[PDB]
Amino acid sequence: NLPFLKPDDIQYFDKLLVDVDESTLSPEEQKERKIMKLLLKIKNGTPPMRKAALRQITDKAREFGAGPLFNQILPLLMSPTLEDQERHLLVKVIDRILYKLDDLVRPYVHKILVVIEPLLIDEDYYARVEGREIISNLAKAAGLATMISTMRPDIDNMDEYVRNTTARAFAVVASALGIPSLLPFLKAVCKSKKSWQARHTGIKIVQQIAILMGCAILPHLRSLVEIIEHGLVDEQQKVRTISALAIAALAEAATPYGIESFDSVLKPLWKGIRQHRGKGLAAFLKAIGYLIPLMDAEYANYYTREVMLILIREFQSPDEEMKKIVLKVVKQCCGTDGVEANYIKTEILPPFFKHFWQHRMALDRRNYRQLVDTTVELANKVGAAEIISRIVDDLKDEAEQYRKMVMETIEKIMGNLGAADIDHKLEEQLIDGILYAFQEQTTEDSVMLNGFGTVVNALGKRVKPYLPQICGTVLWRLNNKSAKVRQQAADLISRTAVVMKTCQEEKLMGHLGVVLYEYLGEEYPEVLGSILGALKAIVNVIGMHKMTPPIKDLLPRLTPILKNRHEKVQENCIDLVGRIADRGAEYVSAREWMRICFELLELLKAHKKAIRRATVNTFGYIAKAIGPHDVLATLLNNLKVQERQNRVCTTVAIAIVAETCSPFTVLPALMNEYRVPELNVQNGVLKSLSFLFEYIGEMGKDYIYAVTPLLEDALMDRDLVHRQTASAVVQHMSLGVYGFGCEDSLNHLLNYVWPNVFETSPHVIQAVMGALEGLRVAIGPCRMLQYCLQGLFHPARKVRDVYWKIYNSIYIGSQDALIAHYPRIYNDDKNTYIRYELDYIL
Amino acid sequence: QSKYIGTGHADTTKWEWLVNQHRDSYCSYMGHFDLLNYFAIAENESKARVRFNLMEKMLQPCGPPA
Amino acid sequence: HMFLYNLTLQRATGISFAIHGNFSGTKQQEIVVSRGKILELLRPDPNTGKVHTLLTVEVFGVIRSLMAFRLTGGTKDYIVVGSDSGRIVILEYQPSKNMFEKIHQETFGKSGCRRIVPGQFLAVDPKGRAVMISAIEKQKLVYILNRDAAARLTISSPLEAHKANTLVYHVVGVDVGFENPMFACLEMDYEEADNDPTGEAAANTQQTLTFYELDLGLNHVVRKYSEPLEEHGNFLITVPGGSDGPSGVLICSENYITYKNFGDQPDIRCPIPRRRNDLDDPERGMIFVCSATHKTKSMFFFLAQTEQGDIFKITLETDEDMVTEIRLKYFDTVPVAAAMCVLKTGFLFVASEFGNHYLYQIAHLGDDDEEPEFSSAMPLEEGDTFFFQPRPLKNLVLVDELDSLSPILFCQIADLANEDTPQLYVACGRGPRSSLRVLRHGVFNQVAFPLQYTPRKFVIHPESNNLIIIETDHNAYTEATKAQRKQQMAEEMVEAELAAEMAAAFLNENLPESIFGAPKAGNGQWASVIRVMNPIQGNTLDLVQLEQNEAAFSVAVCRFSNTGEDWYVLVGVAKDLILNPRSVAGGFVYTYKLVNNGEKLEFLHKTPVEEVPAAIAPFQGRVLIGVGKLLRVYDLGKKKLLRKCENKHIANYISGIQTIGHRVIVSDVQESFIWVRYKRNENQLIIFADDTYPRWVTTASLLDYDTVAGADKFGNICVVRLPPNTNDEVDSQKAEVIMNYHVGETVLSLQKTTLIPGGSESLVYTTLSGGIGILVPFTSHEDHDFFQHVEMHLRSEHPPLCGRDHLSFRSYYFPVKNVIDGDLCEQFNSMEPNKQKNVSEELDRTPPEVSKKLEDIRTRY
Amino acid sequence: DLIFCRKQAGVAIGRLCEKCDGKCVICDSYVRPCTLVRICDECNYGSYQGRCVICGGPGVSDAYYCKECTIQEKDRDGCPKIVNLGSSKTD
């Protein structure tokens, strides 16, 4: 049939709508129509039909020719209405047909490249990788010589954009056919004396080669640098700039190996940073920055000492890009061995914090990020307190961006290195600065919260004297007009609960718990969840006995909050109720727990995973707290009265109760609920048994004999749903008690599971197969092979079918074990079947 | 299914099944060190020699079919 | 209701793989070895010339292929392992912590030593850019290896290189320099051989050498070049390529070594030199058992060992791109090895396939050798080959010897010397390198006494304490037979006149079979000998040589109520036994009187019987003898042994029998145990019990009157027990298996005993790979629950090193039942401290408490 | 109508949305996520990167086989991405 056509498809395959079916009417251009048909089947259509069309177009690729094939493909590729997945389908048909037609594409190479060269600079990353894949397939199809002959004239075009595009195309063909394939061509181009754009694009080719191939250029690194080294001292300025950038990219790709292959370009760069300025100096410094980490400690010391004066001079350049490059180079220098920290804190740090740590940098995003990361990395070598002291007093700056920048820096440094490096003065000014920065903030963003939490947790016990002021401020901010302020306060309490606990300030945290309890009536859901989390933290640090408010008053207040619809409130409230049920269970009555039970069964159906995990945990906690009998009874009655949608909740709860209160408290009542003559309640009991055994796992090792007679009755109950569910039960049974010595009981159950293999209903036969696979796992493949042998060969064809299905299952499952279990098949006149080696006796 | 060698159907001949399990056995001998050691002690041959013999017998372990 | 705890006392000492490299990342060259399911790191000290074991790790799997690789510009060598999981692993040894850090673990198939699931073969591009893991049939997988910004190894997705109905003999990566990586495989298609009922295709199909090329540009793998071979080869060797060598491969075959390379390179073949006046069978071929390469910045050479144990040095003559000839020179003679390693600083490590391993120092590389060197240029016709005479070693000097109990064939624990604590008497070794060793402990100390052939069983004389050992080997000559063969050779070679003096020199030359191998020849020849050995002094008090085709398989010393309290020794012997296909003439039972206080065998008579007597067991003044599938009671007559009672309903073939009271426990070769009752009143043997499972039982031990523990050919241990108060006059009784466990090594001896006096009674087993293990029962269920929790926690938190699942591993052929793996539990002390703290608080105690518990359970024995 | 990809899985980790966050791709079980799901390169390329392996929605966490499948080694059968054979790649 003809697949569907979207509007934009009409212009491309409209000729397929015409009903002139007869091929003799076609003037040998059925090839055109055949390609149109195949491409329409590939682009639009199910996986089977597009697979068939792809195979068809690949098997006939040479019979068609590259000409019409690409003259129909390329228009579709550059269409602005093309979807990304359609583009991928086109790229894959392209590379397959290109593999098929070897040199048939050579004349059209040019015509192809100009259509697909823009893809190499497209914003979409996948478009770029597809363009590179297409160029590489082209270079593998059409010879290297053809690629060179086709892309050579553009290397000295006056426009620079075409030069860049052909340079990256040459990089791609170098990746496709190997660097040594282009080594002589690039060596000749980089020294081309006729044009300077030629050598410019040549060393740009090697730069893009490094950028694209990464560490895979380490074998040819010395050859590439020997090809491009002369361009450093070339009198044209742009070519030496791009040769410096190419050296930078080569060092970046080769990290951390291959410094010895750079022994030539060290002296030219060293001279150039004294003989250059502007963008060329930036390029030279960037190359040296990516080059320094590869050096040995001694030579790193020497070379950094040589370049340090020039770079700290450039520290104060008007061009911000030069500032970014010198920031990266100081980060690269101080991150390596050899340059010791005393040198850094004597020479580099003062001008660094002079010219780089000014408020102007707190506005540009990338400058902000690079400055912060550079300072944090410096702290790893020079010392945490050494850097924190130079910027801590700036925490009290009224420019909010500057103080948030310094706050993030202090946060990351103290999270990396703790606080053992900090003395008393630095500690006090840290506390003062974080207090001011938290009190005077317009927005409620997480930088200040994270900084406060991390600095307090890093100080640890050292924070005892400042806790009264911290808690006064958090109490003052809890009573605020903005919800996102009290939310942040509650989150700070949640994060510093344990460090307050170690400081032994339990009365203050009790007051915090009381004000949170009285704020529990909050309307905004996110901040209510935050204060619930703070309450949970407080109840976790101080015990369930000395908790204020008492648990007796705290839990019934939480009970109605479970009906709130917001997921954050749900998760936090469930977690708090669960901690209470784990520890302070003795303080509330059994009926409050039963009401919470009723409102927890619903939350087992939450779509968010954490909410239902918490629900499971707290339900198990309260089931361990109160008696299993009452909840089990109401759950069994629920099992009877409930429909399928909410029956899964009650079965999961039954399994949870069986796991927390050992199953002999749940299995008797469940199994007796099976004797009622109604069959649907029997099926519900069977499904609950199935999930119970899957859920308890190894716990069910002591209960196979108990549930055995019910399964005997259910497996020949002449109701297909019952047999299917019972087979699922024994499957989960055997998979849960694997390796716990339940071989005899499961072998007994196997005899009742087996006769159901001759069933036709797909669901019940797949359930029986799953039961047999689990029984293979638990009993062993030898016994299942013993059961299969009696029917592997047999006059009846259908019994052969079923027994060969079972054999295939156990053979795929345990192919290597069967070696010891195959029967002794004697020889005959025609063949020899005895495995004589296994009969050897030493 | 069809992708996995050694599986069978209702038309699997005795010869096919037995040559499959014989090849499985020979590969398992190649794999398990102590099994091959037992074989190389029973027959007074080196481990390389018995491995070569097993790979040779892999071709027609039970004989030609009908 | 018995629960056991398993502990290895002496780990396996038999090496299956060995590779050398810079695993420490320094000047030092280490060797990692795969022995069974254990991975070990050893460091040879160049100053003292002695090997030290730095690291030992139980990986709980079956290592099938071991290889080392390095990336460009790197300093340390990684370890890539293929095992019986569906996983390939890459590891790095960290010397800071003395551990194997798992760098990568990639999953591709199901577990086990399967046929089509890769793991058996490993090859790696000589530059480290890719690695191919291959099955024996069909499927192969190539992984691309690279680094990142932080110099951390990264592995890609697998690339498929499958070819249906295709076997694989070997695969190695060809040194193509930095071109597209290529892997050379020895293959053979069986599709045509299967669909042809005559046999034309099977005989006409031939092995092929194929090259899978990895196009990194297009990023796929293509079957590029494939060519048949007129000779079927067994393995491949990569020759250096690119800059410092001519790319290509060496193919070792039967009676030849070939060089081949893709392109217009002519195949350069050369026959393998055969021994001068070899006593082996003239119609028996010759192949190489292992190879080793050593690269200099000036030259490179190869070392290849023959089945005979002769190591030859191989060099290739270079004419720019092409090679001109293959040159070979007889280097030396060491025991047959599974792996050889040529380190720097002039040291050669030889890992024997059986028995002790060695390390030599290279004194001279045999370049200034007066001995003739051979080459492919030398011409000859009629297929006559190059010859050479073996000589005592002088290129190498033995600098270290490592004791290896592999292969343990029999074991008995007893305090023969009055040390008040028992010792382990272990009949192990193989061929002329066989040995009876006495092991003590206070790891074990050992003393070794050499033997002639491979020992099968040995019994202890109660009054004298001496041992009656039987040693038997296949296709070997007896002493008289090798003497007469030497005589016939010397008399035939003088017909062609200095041949008289040459024959005198040949006959007066008796090279030690301990070093130059035993002159072995024939298809059904059997060299067998009985000996009586003192257990304290290595001296043998008497020795009895048997006929040329008589092979001893069972021995027992006992008295008879028929005669007095004088002793007797019975030996069962097969005649004209063929192993494959199996056919035998019959059996004989030799009866010796054993006089002079257990020091002299006095022959009495020699009874023929229908098949091979595989088991002899004393039985209240009579003996119990298993002849094929027949069980018989024999009394000592004055001219023969007269049958008194027979049972003919044993399944296949009796391998062993043990008696408790009047119960007889018969081991079948395939059908597990069979309980037989001897009714003394009526004089009849009645089968009354058997098993519900088949087991290839190798040994067995009686636990009590109802319980029997047995060992499997497939490395399993089981414990079966009869139902309570089973009546022996009612048949059709089945025994239930109360214990199942997989050791990972094939156990050949089980014995219930106490190693330290007064301590715990336990179950000691010995494996075929030289391992000593113990199973101890649990005193209280408190400890049992503790160790079950420890086992499950270590399973979840310290998974096996090569991607295997521990529970699945210990359930290899049967689901594990009532055994705790103490070898896994004791890896608690090698975890990261935070994981130790977590799993300890989960056990509600401190890590030192858990440690102390493990130490006390090990000292308890 | 719906079938598993079953191609050779690679180094891409399968993903799951919020609706299917705790489910097993093979047997739809929520009990004991054991080992990590790997998918083939073709099912992870393009706009399909990070999408749910089961339903195809936006992935929020990683996908796992259940322990029952791990025990039965059903995590060794290939790429478990569910593909619909009656839908083009634009639907």
Ligand SMILES: CC[C@H](O)[C@@H](C)[C@H]1O[C@@H]1C[C@@](C)(O)/C=C/C=C(\C)[C@H]1OC(=O)C[C@H](O)CC[C@@](C)(O)[C@@H](OC(C)=O)/C=C/[C@@H]1C
């Ligand atoms: C009859 C089986 C069936 O599939 C139902 C569970 C399914 O129809 C529901 C749909 C839904 C939406 O209601 C799912 C609920 C799922 C729940 C409550 C599961 O916890 C989760 O999914 C959350 C986490 O990943 C895992 C939590 C953990 C470790 O506690 C686990 O415990 C064990 C022992 O596995 C508990 C498993 C729970 C059954």
Ligand SMILES: [Zn+2]
């Ligand atoms: Zn599952």
Ligand SMILES: [Zn+2]
């Ligand atoms: Zn997929």
Ligand SMILES: [Zn+2]
């Ligand atoms: Zn989903």
